Amino acid sequence: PSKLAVAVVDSSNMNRSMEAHNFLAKKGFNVRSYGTGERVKLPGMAFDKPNVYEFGTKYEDIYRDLESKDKEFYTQNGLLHMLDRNRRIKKCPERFQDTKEQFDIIVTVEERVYDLVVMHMESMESVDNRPVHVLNVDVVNNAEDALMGAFVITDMINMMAKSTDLDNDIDELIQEFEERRKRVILHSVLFY
Amino acid sequence: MTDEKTATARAKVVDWCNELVIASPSTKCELLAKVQETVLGSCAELAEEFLESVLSLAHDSNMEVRKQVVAFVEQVCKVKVELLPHVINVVSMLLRDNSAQVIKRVIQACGSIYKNGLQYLCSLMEPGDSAEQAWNILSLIKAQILDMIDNENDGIRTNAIKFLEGVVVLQSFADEDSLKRDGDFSLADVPDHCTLFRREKLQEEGNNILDILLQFHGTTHISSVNLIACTSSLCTIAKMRPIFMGAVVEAFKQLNANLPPTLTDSQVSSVRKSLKMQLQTLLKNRGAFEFASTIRGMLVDLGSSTNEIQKLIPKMDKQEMARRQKRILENA
């Protein structure tokens, strides 16, 4: 129950960001989630040619679409299980490049997403001159690793929420968190 | 012609302003958001006679209330900039605030406030005493924030670096190589009829602030966040004002050859990733023509491929190239 505005960003806003969104919302954080990809991309029947949707498509509609295609296979892998949690959290997956929302902390789940977030915020001229900490926490794109990743991200945000002056303590906090968790956390500052 | 809209709006805010003196800090912030929405929006004419009601709350004990007052004054300088001499004192005073969260919010607000304030004072044909005194406070705000690059709080230093970036950009001349930006204002937009200040003195100050930013960028015990912020601010200055291109390319070259020993491995990667992005941005500027090979060299050191770098260089006709090549030989 801090006043930190937090965003978790991945590629599709389907697996990794929603897993983190779920646990952070339960912890009482002001949390939002987005995807950096051009379109929403879910895995399919085999390698390549997967399920593609436009950003703004309801999770409910994606659930019903995968249900009509193959209700049995998409239950066995667990994509319908995943789509059920997302519809409970929010209406549809959102794109980071299109949001006008402002945050204190932006967490990306892989270096490629980090680059896309940082490129986008730099492409826009500063108005409020308000800084935002952009952090990278590597999360492998699978159900098991998205779950473990969501615990690491909740952990990191909780440690940051405890600080009385996040700006003045963040570099030391990351450094100690990196050491304890045997992780590399890229950290940059961007402006609104 | 008349209507009931103004009187109905005035009665709605008279109530809200009366509630403030007896309201809780949470209620005070809720009331102020409604007062701002009407007095600076729905019924903009009411703004002047409800100013002292809002500005008095700058002395309030709650930091959130003080921060709401900052957001109000910032909005005033955007929509009713003629009221700047009546709100600018509060800004300078709130830069002495004990709360770091308040100081940061004031520094952020000063970005648009200084730009709007400089634009308005320039436009005046016969500037009064109110104008001279508003400019004096604006001059003191620049000096106050300039001192904050040595503040003990990292957040305050980050905000101060960002403020100083906009001042350099405003207090220099744009040229044909300057990146095309919609609301861009330079010393070229400052008239000769202006008695309040001299173009040459503002240019001198801009150059001194740049020299301070270049010097700050090269220290051995700078934090990773302040270093990444200073690097992107130096990049914005060079793409907006390519007269500073050579100096910024030199500072980037020196940084890549000597990373502060205070940086962790993770911080070095973060700094180098941001530096790589700033160099890509500058290489796209036509004014970086002379420094293209130096930039390329740094981009190769930072892992860019020959073809990634090559695609960034703007296409130039041989006549434009010869104009530039001769000017570079002339200047030396």
From Swiss-Prot, chain B:
Localisation per UniProt entry: Nucleus
Ranges occupied by HEAT repeats: 6-41, 44-78, 81-123, 130-169, 201-240
Effect of gene knockout: RNAi-mediated knockdown results in overproliferation of testicular cystocytes undergoing transit amplification leading to increased incidence of spermatogonial tumors.
Superkingdom as given in the UniProt entry: Eukaryota
Note on domains (UniProt): The HEAT repeats have been determined based on 3D-structure analysis and are not detected by sequence-based prediction programs.
Assembly with partners or alone: Interacts with Cpsf73 and Cpsf100 forming a core cleavage factor required for both polyadenylated and histone mRNA processing. Interacts with Slbp and Lsm11.
Function: Component of a protein complex required for cotranscriptional processing of 3'-ends of polyadenylated and histone pre-mRNA. Involved in germline stem cell transit amplification, differentiation and mitosis-to-meiosis transition.
Entry similarity comment: Belongs to the Symplekin family.
The protein's name: Symplekin
Source organism of this protein record: Drosophila melanogaster (Fruit fly)
Classification of source organism: Eukaryota, Metazoa, Ecdysozoa, Arthropoda, Hexapoda
Residues of the full protein shown: 19 to 349 of 1165
